[PDB]
Amino acid sequence: GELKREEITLLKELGSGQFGVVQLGKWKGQYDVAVKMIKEGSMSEDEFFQEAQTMMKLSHPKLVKFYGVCSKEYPIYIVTEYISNGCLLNYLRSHGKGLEPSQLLEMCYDVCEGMAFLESHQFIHRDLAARNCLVDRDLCVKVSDFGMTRYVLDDQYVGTKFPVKWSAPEVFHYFKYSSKSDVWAFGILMWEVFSLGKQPYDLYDNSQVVLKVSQGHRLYRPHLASDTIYQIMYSCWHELPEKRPTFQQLLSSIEPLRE
Ligand SMILES: */C(C)=C\C(=O)N[C@H]1CCCN(c2c(F)cc(C(N)=O)c3[nH]c(C)c(C)c23)C1
Ligand SMILES: [Cl-]
């Protein structure tokens, strides 16, 4: 729902997000928040504000908590809880010396559990990647910004920022987004986690990745991934969406491996 703009105090810039500037703030003199600044003309506002009511209801412990919006003037505020360790990708890249396989599996489990919740509500993320998940002070991973690419108005010029390297073939060929394309992206995220934040298909440009993935190329097993864990991420990358597991099945598959 709608928040009172003056009940948000902006404290410092967190950086430039996919959707604009993001600020650390305080809400109601009590709660630590992140505030996404949404500029005029950047979003299909009608569609977004309908979905903003959906975002508010889609609450889960492994989803970043959405508090509300300030929508009556620009910039629009999207207000979420503050998650202190920032994006999962940079966490991996700066904590690899201390991270062990059991913790890496727990990170994947957290994301899978949030995604199973979204799947159960027929909600498609569209842009799952380690860069888009957040790590809290207790190393719980939370899914963030789910669904937000749908309301972006700017041409992505599919040089492009379009996330080909996380995209199932039906996404890069047909732009067909589904919970099964989210599953493909989840497998790529599992690879990012177990590789301690490597870039997928590092030596290759987007055109090379479309051809190689179309021809059956898949990411190699990270050193820290067991055969069982590799089989889980690899199962996410079937050419056919109907041959990929659901997030409910993946969650089932990961649970017995936790330590
Ligand atoms: C990783 C590869 C990226 C990254 O951390 N990017 C930044 C860009 C600025 C905004 N960032 C951001 C955010 F959007 C939300 C939160 C939050 N809900 O707490 C957040 N916390 C931190 C510490 C950052 C940097 C955050 C992500
Ligand atoms: Cl590796």
Curated annotation (Swiss-Prot):
Free-text tissue specificity from the UniProt record: Highly expressed in cells with great migratory potential, including endothelial cells and metastatic carcinoma cell lines.
Residue ranges annotated for the Protein kinase domain, each copy included: 8-259
Subcellular localization: Cytoplasm
Subunit annotation: Interacts with BCAR1, CAV1, MYD88, PTK2/FAK1, RUFY1, RUFY2, STAT3, TIRAP and TNFRSF1B.
Free-text note on domains in this protein's UniProt record: SH2 domain mediates interaction with RUFY1.
Primary role: Non-receptor tyrosine kinase that plays central but diverse modulatory roles in various signaling processes involved in the regulation of actin reorganization, cell migration, cell proliferation and survival, cell adhesion, and apoptosis. Participates in signal transduction stimulated by growth factor receptors, cytokine receptors, G-protein coupled receptors, antigen receptors and integrins. Induces tyrosine phosphorylation of BCAR1 in response to integrin regulation.
Name of the protein in its database record: Cytoplasmic tyrosine-protein kinase BMX
Source organism per UniProt: Homo sapiens (Human)
Gene: BMX
